[PDB]
Amino acid sequence: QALQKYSTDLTARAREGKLDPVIGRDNEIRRVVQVLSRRTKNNPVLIGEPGVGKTAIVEGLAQRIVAGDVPESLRDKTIVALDLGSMVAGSKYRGEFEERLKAVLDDIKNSAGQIITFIDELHTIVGAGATGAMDAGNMIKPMLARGELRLVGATTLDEYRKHIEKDAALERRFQQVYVGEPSVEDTIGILRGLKDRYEVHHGVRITDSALVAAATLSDRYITARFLPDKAIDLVDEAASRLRMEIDSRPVEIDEVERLVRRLEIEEMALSLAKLRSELADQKEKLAELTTRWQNEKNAKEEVGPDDIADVVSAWTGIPAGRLLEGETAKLLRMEDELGKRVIGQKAAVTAVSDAVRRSRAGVSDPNRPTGAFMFLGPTGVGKTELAKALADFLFDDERAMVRIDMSEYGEKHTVARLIGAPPGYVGYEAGGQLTEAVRRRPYTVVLFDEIEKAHPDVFDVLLQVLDEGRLTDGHGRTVDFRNTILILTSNLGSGGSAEQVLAAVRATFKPEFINRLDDVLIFEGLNPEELVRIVDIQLAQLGKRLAQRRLQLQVSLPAKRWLAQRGFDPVYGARPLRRLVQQAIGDQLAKMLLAGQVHDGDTVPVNVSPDADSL
Amino acid sequence: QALQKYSTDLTARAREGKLDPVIGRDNEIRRVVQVLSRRTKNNPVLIGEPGVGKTAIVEGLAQRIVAGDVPESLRDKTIVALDLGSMVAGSKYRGEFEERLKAVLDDIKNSAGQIITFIDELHTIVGAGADAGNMIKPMLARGELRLVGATTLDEYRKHIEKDAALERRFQQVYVGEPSVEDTIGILRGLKDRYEVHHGV
Amino acid sequence: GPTGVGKTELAKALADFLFDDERAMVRIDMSEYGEKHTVARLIGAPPGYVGYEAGGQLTEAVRRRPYTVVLFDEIEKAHPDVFDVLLQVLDEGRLTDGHGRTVDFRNTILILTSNLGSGGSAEQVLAAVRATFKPEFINRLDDVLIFEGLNPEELVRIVDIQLAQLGKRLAQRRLQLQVSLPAKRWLAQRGFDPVYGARPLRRLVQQAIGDQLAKMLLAGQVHDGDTVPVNVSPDADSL
Amino acid sequence: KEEVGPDDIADVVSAWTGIPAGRLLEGETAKLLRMEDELGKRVIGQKAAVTAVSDAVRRSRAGVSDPNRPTGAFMFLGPTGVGKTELAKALADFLFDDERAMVRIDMSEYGEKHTVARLIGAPPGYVGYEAGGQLTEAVRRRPYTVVLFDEIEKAHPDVFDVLLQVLDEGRLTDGHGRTVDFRNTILILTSNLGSGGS
Amino acid sequence: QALQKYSTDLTARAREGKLDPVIGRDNEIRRVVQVLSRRTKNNPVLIGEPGVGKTAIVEGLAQRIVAGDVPESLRDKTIVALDLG
Ligand SMILES: Nc1ncnc2c1ncn2[C@@H]1O[C@H](COP(=O)(O)OP(=O)(O)OP(O)(O)=S)[C@@H](O)[C@H]1O
Ligand SMILES: Nc1ncnc2c1ncn2[C@@H]1O[C@H](COP(=O)(O)OP(=O)(O)OP(O)(O)=S)[C@@H](O)[C@H]1O
Ligand SMILES: Nc1ncnc2c1ncn2[C@@H]1O[C@H](COP(=O)(O)OP(=O)(O)OP(O)(O)=S)[C@@H](O)[C@H]1O
Ligand SMILES: Nc1ncnc2c1ncn2[C@@H]1O[C@H](COP(=O)(O)OP(=O)(O)OP(O)(O)=S)[C@@H](O)[C@H]1O
Ligand SMILES: Nc1ncnc2c1ncn2[C@@H]1O[C@H](COP(=O)(O)OP(=O)(O)OP(O)(O)=S)[C@@H](O)[C@H]1O
Ligand SMILES: Nc1ncnc2c1ncn2[C@@H]1O[C@H](COP(=O)(O)OP(=O)(O)O)[C@@H](O)[C@H]1O
């Protein structure tokens, strides 16, 4: 009678239909029924990596027992789920748990071959009762050998060689049933049967296109779990996305209302102007949308394959939408928009814009990095400027990329600072400097500065990165560089030719490494015309830096071409101009400013006095 | 008489205004809520680098619950702040942590759905074993206790992620650092209490 | 043999009808075992050290299911000390771990790729093996194979599968594309290099078609249901 | 002014963490102009090599300089016994009132190629790992020091590849992966090339 | 009031006259009072060599309280010495 008090039941809960319908997996149910009817030692252990369905199999067996596809031996058995957790409730005396478990075993034995026990997560049955001296968990050990209790269990694969293989007298008493995960085509069949329980809990409608999308779209992106269920959660979270909008009123409008309320708060607290404008603008927008809303009303209720993509975009934030109206105007105005920071070198900006546009269009290959290439030329041209320029509109940031340098790697053994240390050695919890920093938010751009100065041993670690985008650290976690962007910089062949530098690449490298790369983009020198448009940007940039004390400048054309005509080196590139500006302006304004008389406010002109320039 | 001698109540703590008036973070609230109201496996974890406001998100959620702005199936959910650091208090025995935890789980699942939980620093959900901290694993993958947590990022890849049967139960709301101008908006939001406590 | 030939596409193809998967093999990589102490990540630590209840990365992946084909990629770049670990794998069938539980490689398939020589016909590329591998490691192996280059007759048909594969990538958008025979015989003319194999052709396919298809696909005016043709405007591949 | 102001915030962020920034409140600016002729009271000689050093400190504390560069990277050379180290130590005297804030590291130690790792550390799995590096742990505390690279000719051409990325970025990494930032330090590296020519 | 038979008190004893001379060290008290009146962080720890008189610092703080020199926003506090054995 203690089974009423210590155990649950899974057959009474099966006659009420309060379990989920179990679809597929005929072979494992047949294997469990095959094992669970032999003469002695009839008790299986379901083993598999977590997620594959091991609790689903036992509930499907309960469904079959109530249904009647069972053999004639297993008729009317009434699976009872024990608890080795809730049976050590109050047992601080030296004999209570022992007789309690003995009373449960005599209650099972006192019923003539009916009860199928079910102990879930049986790796915690070994050290159940600690008597200071092993005397608990080896009370069922003489009983399983004759096979009087049937004992269905389900333990994780890597929880099995930690507790049971440690204590291997018991491991022979159990038969093992391995469970592997299905493929995509069976997940498509599973998801169409669970589209009967999420329509009731959430009163919505679900398109089959969402199922055939999410069964495949989460086979590339969320590469951290296993898949009978990693496609279920996207469906349920998209249903909640829809239910949040079927209730009282939509979303953006909510976004804008909260935002303008915030800016209102801030502004009134300050009473900054500024925000005053951005308020008004945001009030225009929120007005327009509102009207549009009404209009529409005057004139959807189901989920589709776009909401699945938006949910996957909202988590492991790789953008994966249809590219609907948000960035297509920026994706077309992208080559010339990137030309507000890089002057000239059109053939490289085109080859970067191409590799971004074909990635977001969804034309490229699911197992290769989205773009991994190496541009090189002379010094002071803008090869680090371009890599910091395209990390500015993917993110609206400047520092989310992972910039490492290979000028530290002048020796053979330093490779281990980016791959972790093997087990048994000092830094083992720390992992790798690289691999522990890309597994979080896998969309950042990666640079490898100065590939020349590295010793020829780090070249053979990137050799598997560029083609099959996996990498393995010290633990064993396969990180994926599937949809990052890899950029190599160099300095080979500063003034030779367009083919003397191309014969210089092949000397230091091998054919196995040049073949992995995309187009090796040669950078040219500069032009005296194209230098002029550099100078303006310099005189914009410092022109913002003095805005904090609200000084600015009124610079005329003769000074602005005087800066261009001097400091023109075809060798050193556009780097001496950033010294010439602060020699001509910075020391003069430093002497004049901090002795008073250049008060915040009045902007001072500059003009040339025949050699130099003065205020 | 079980969950009133161990765990406090943030909702009763917000009936007067004894919190901090959070400003901003729209996507984090609008992600935490529409994970907290699904059917199965419905417990988020606020993973963030330390010192970014992972507690102020939950307090803002509490104020949004009390002021009546949340969606329909969250009417007055009365979120509770458990603390497992005070439940391993009196125990030099066998089986004393088990009953003390079981009374709390039974008083949560014994009522209806109004015991949305909150454990801060759930990296210490693993310890105090001896097999313990393991009555909760069948409970989490059935959607009963809603268990909103928040841990630092370095502890999470040191304790929990080794034990992937656990971290298959939690979702991951990620919280990143703000920019400069939005921090200025935060600071102009909090120009209320610092001028009252210090009278300048 | 040389590069860009098919020495990994072969080993990912006999794991495709024995299993009907492509992830069901143990693809570990010996491009990272540059030093003498990277042996320990696949055999475990001796008992008493930090990671002891973790097992090997090799021993605790065959002991689960002892049937999967296993590769070893770029056997040059490993230090000449992992070869002596791989030695008793062959010709005995077992190794041990920290716990001493032996695992059995009786019925796997070990496949060893390489990039040796790159320019000997058959004599010199087999004369470069003997300087690097000892006479007790060549002796353990089966047929040491040599891969030939690529005839220009072969490189035609490759293009077929390439375009066929691209067709099965464009089924979600329901966009079908019609390739003419002049555009199909044009790619083998432009993309033949007897040094780099057939990998530079798979940049030529995405520079010919992909550069302008990615622009036409997201600017509007091309939608599902189209049979987009490619035909040789006298140099490029105009749509 | 009886309430708080943005000059008390300067004192809070200045006394704590040890960076003398602000807006040049009065008391040091009169000393800041009397600095070239002040430096000519230990460094005698060198009329035209003091003003370039003056036009780094007065250019940097005046708030007109790039936020991502060190505030000085100049190098100087010539004959021996002219007082290079003496000028560097007088410069360290002027803005610390001390002598041990300067971080002198040798360059006559580095003839061998493997001896570079004193100023980086060791990768994870090697002998000195919990310690770190000389030149990194020296600057993780006291982040306002002047650093000295005495006689950088004797260093064979692979040490030059390390401090190549100290310059132009203002960052450095070590064994743990913690980027230390040299954004507000003086870098002075003395040489001995030439010695007789023009 | 029920723990004072199980704990101690150096506020009611601070008006007895059992307190030591507070000669010297009248800047660290200002540092501790500056730490103590904040919104966060208001739990200082005195870090130094043992056997110097950190206990005497806290006794001098209590002796300053019982006559009154800290501001009125920390007026009439009660300080409890804890029984660490
Ligand atoms: N073959 C299947 N048929 C029906 N439902 C399934 C199937 N596989 C998985 N599911 C459902 O998908 C989810 C998978 O979660 P579970 O299988 O219960 O987790 P589990 O199998 O217990 O693994 P762990 O390690 O115990 S968390 C549940 O909601 C199942 O009902
Ligand atoms: N075309 C250009 N457009 C804008 N800024 C430029 C251009 N060319 C040079 N510059 C500037 O000059 C510097 C060159 O940028 P970098 O790319 O960092 O130098 P580099 O080309 O990387 O050469 P190294 O060898 O890496 S120092 C930066 O400060 C740029 O702002
Ligand atoms: N958006 C915000 N609104 C109001 N206060 C905020 C906001 N963001 C941060 N804070 C304040 O910043 C501090 C951070 O508090 P916590 O959230 O507890 O810190 P944390 O992010 O949890 O990191 P730890 O683990 O607590 S050190 C508190 O004083 C908050 O009031
Ligand atoms: N003979 C071939 N038949 C079919 N596909 C081929 C052939 N040769 C090359 N390929 C394709 O070329 C691409 C790369 O070939 P891989 O075999 O991966 O390179 P590899 O032969 O392994 O040489 P390495 O040394 O590993 S770089 C894949 O898309 C292959 O399908
Ligand atoms: N311009 C000067 N004014 C005052 N004293 C000087 C001057 N130049 C040199 N001295 C003195 O001469 C000594 C050598 O000067 P330093 O500049 O320290 O030599 P140094 O820099 O070590 O030269 P090298 O090339 O590195 S061996 C110092 O101890 C100074 O006191
Ligand atoms: N300002 C002071 N006035 C009186 N006694 C002091 C003073 N400073 C230190 N002492 C002496 O030091 C002792 C207290 O030291 P304490 O702070 O307890 O050091 P610790 O905590 O390391 O034991 C007292 O017995 C006292 O005689």
mmCIF file of C-alpha atoms in Angstrom, chain E residues 2-77:
data_model
loop_
_atom_site.group_PDB
_atom_site.id
_atom_site.type_symbol
_atom_site.label_atom_id
_atom_site.label_comp_id
_atom_site.label_asym_id
_atom_site.label_seq_id
_atom_site.Cartn_x
_atom_site.Cartn_y
_atom_site.Cartn_z
ATOM 1 C CA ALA E 2 17.436 38.524 23.524
ATOM 2 C CA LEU E 3 20.803 38.058 21.781
ATOM 3 C CA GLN E 4 22.751 40.312 24.168
ATOM 4 C CA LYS E 5 23.139 37.433 26.615
ATOM 5 C CA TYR E 6 24.589 35.441 23.689
ATOM 6 C CA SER E 7 26.369 38.334 21.914
ATOM 7 C CA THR E 8 28.117 41.458 23.191
ATOM 8 C CA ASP E 9 27.706 45.246 22.978
ATOM 9 C CA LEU E 10 30.168 48.159 22.840
ATOM 10 C CA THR E 11 27.624 50.980 22.638
ATOM 11 C CA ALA E 12 26.145 50.747 26.127
ATOM 12 C CA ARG E 13 29.643 49.903 27.360
ATOM 13 C CA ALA E 14 30.899 52.945 25.426
ATOM 14 C CA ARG E 15 29.213 55.213 27.994
ATOM 15 C CA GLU E 16 30.841 53.381 30.913
ATOM 16 C CA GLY E 17 34.402 54.563 30.403
ATOM 17 C CA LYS E 18 36.059 51.257 29.541
ATOM 18 C CA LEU E 19 37.440 52.803 26.340
ATOM 19 C CA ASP E 20 41.118 53.400 25.647
ATOM 20 C CA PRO E 21 42.909 56.657 24.814
ATOM 21 C CA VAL E 22 42.359 57.559 21.167
ATOM 22 C CA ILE E 23 45.706 59.356 20.830
ATOM 23 C CA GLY E 24 46.654 59.765 17.189
ATOM 24 C CA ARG E 25 45.123 58.346 14.003
ATOM 25 C CA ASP E 26 42.488 60.940 13.156
ATOM 26 C CA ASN E 27 42.369 60.522 9.373
ATOM 27 C CA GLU E 28 41.434 56.853 8.976
ATOM 28 C CA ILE E 29 38.285 57.645 10.977
ATOM 29 C CA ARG E 30 37.391 60.225 8.332
ATOM 30 C CA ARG E 31 38.050 57.606 5.638
ATOM 31 C CA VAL E 32 35.743 55.091 7.366
ATOM 32 C CA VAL E 33 32.955 57.641 7.873
ATOM 33 C CA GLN E 34 33.318 58.633 4.198
ATOM 34 C CA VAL E 35 32.912 54.980 3.176
ATOM 35 C CA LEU E 36 30.029 54.417 5.577
ATOM 36 C CA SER E 37 27.694 57.091 4.159
ATOM 37 C CA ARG E 38 27.144 55.928 0.580
ATOM 38 C CA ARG E 39 24.348 54.240 -1.316
ATOM 39 C CA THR E 40 26.184 51.036 -2.188
ATOM 40 C CA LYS E 41 29.567 49.823 -0.857
ATOM 41 C CA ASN E 42 28.738 50.840 2.744
ATOM 42 C CA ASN E 43 30.504 47.977 4.485
ATOM 43 C CA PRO E 44 34.189 48.803 4.996
ATOM 44 C CA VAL E 45 36.939 46.330 5.771
ATOM 45 C CA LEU E 46 40.108 47.414 7.566
ATOM 46 C CA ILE E 47 43.050 45.672 5.909
ATOM 47 C CA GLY E 48 46.466 45.667 7.515
ATOM 48 C CA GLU E 49 48.988 43.875 9.664
ATOM 49 C CA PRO E 50 47.639 42.177 12.810
ATOM 50 C CA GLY E 51 48.235 43.540 16.272
ATOM 51 C CA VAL E 52 48.073 47.233 15.340
ATOM 52 C CA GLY E 53 44.738 48.355 16.756
ATOM 53 C CA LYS E 54 41.901 48.131 14.241
ATOM 54 C CA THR E 55 39.748 47.312 17.272
ATOM 55 C CA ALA E 56 40.986 50.591 18.755
ATOM 56 C CA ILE E 57 39.912 52.324 15.526
ATOM 57 C CA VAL E 58 36.375 51.012 15.959
ATOM 58 C CA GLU E 59 36.434 51.933 19.667
ATOM 59 C CA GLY E 60 37.507 55.452 18.711
ATOM 60 C CA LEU E 61 34.663 55.585 16.208
ATOM 61 C CA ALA E 62 32.186 54.584 18.929
ATOM 62 C CA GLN E 63 33.760 57.121 21.300
ATOM 63 C CA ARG E 64 33.266 59.751 18.598
ATOM 64 C CA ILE E 65 29.633 58.640 18.224
ATOM 65 C CA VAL E 66 28.696 58.780 21.931
ATOM 66 C CA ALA E 67 29.626 62.477 22.081
ATOM 67 C CA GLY E 68 28.625 63.244 18.493
ATOM 68 C CA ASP E 69 30.763 64.467 15.602
ATOM 69 C CA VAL E 70 29.504 62.421 12.604
ATOM 70 C CA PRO E 71 26.616 64.140 10.734
ATOM 71 C CA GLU E 72 22.979 63.851 11.760
ATOM 72 C CA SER E 73 22.231 61.368 8.956
ATOM 73 C CA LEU E 74 24.135 58.813 11.098
ATOM 74 C CA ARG E 75 22.909 59.998 14.509
ATOM 75 C CA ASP E 76 22.644 57.538 17.439
ATOM 76 C CA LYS E 77 23.715 54.240 15.937
#
